[PDB]
Design a protein around this ligand. Sequence first.
Ligand SMILES: Nc1ncnc2c1ncn2[C@@H]1O[C@H](COP(=O)(O)OP(=O)(O)OP(=O)(O)O)[C@@H](O)[C@H]1O
Ligand SMILES: N#CCc1c[nH]c2ccc(C(F)(F)F)cc12
Length: 327
Amino acid sequence: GPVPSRARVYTDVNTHRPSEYWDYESHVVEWGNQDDYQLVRKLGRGKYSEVFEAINITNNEKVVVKILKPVAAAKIKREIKILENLRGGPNIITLADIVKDPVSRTPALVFEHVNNTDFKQLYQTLTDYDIRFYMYEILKALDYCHSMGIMHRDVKPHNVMIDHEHRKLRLIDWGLAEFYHPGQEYNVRVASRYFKGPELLVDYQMYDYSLDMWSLGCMLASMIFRKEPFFHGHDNYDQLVRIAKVLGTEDLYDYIDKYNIELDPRFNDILGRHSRKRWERFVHSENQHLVSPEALDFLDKLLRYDHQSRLTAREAMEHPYFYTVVK
Ligand SMILES: Nc1ncnc2c1ncn2[C@@H]1O[C@H](COP(=O)(O)OP(=O)(O)OP(=O)(O)O)[C@@H](O)[C@H]1O
Ligand SMILES: N#CCc1c[nH]c2ccc(C(F)(F)F)cc12
């Protein structure tokens, strides 16, 4: 069957920590006072929650309340434990409280509010310097959570809040996050389609933190090349074909061979034969201002089929692409 894999960094984190750290089922939730929060307006509704802007009436400060939809309780305790474990970490959203919603009778996660800049404005106007600056801020969040034995598994621009006025970034939406345990087989139905790593698309379950680094590369490619999304699959199968038209099919077959993966036969008629395209092929007059040899070298080291061959978040921080960023 498939050959096992383990991360090349932070494999022992959850072994060195006490069981209480990762055993989220055993965690006893400390419930706050639901009346401290007055809902102001609905901000959105996803598959797993309804999101509201609210006011903490004990300090008159804005908060965001995520009221969980009645779903599997195991997912809820996992997100709570991860948020508590990561609290105070660089650029990690702060979980301010956990209360029982009086209407839904389900948990409501209270977060610090970020006065976030409109997603479209960020995509359209962040400069070359700003992309490098904010990518460095995301790497601080990812190296932190990976160093804490957690993979985010849903890295994408809608999960990265920026209050541009205050040069403030927060990595949010930890609902798909998981503790990394070497040898564990994980569910491949994670991340948004355009950000799914090849490991997910080829149904390789023994993945790790490096999945986040692929997602980050997808985010970077779409920003610098002005191509939203960069890999535009019609479904999860066509998603792998879109990647193969850029990275080539030879390296894909080598990846499948190395990990002894049985590729879904549905791919035999759609993958075709493709050679890697040099990153310069995607440069044009409308994206030249965001492209540099350092950006292309960095992107090249994230977008690799072999999850063990990608830069880790800490190695990425050392890359020349960030030399210009004020530290
Ligand atoms: N801490 C926070 N501060 C401010 N706004 C927040 C915070 N957390 C979440 N939000 C906002 O809550 C809103 C609703 O979130 P939701 O997951 O339902 O939608 P979405 O982000 O637009 O979708 P998706 O990420 O799946 O594409 C979004 O506009 C998001 O920016
Ligand atoms: N794509 C897109 C827009 C966007 C939303 N949140 C971000 C966080 C970082 C970056 C960075 F500039 F660093 F790539 C971009 C965004």
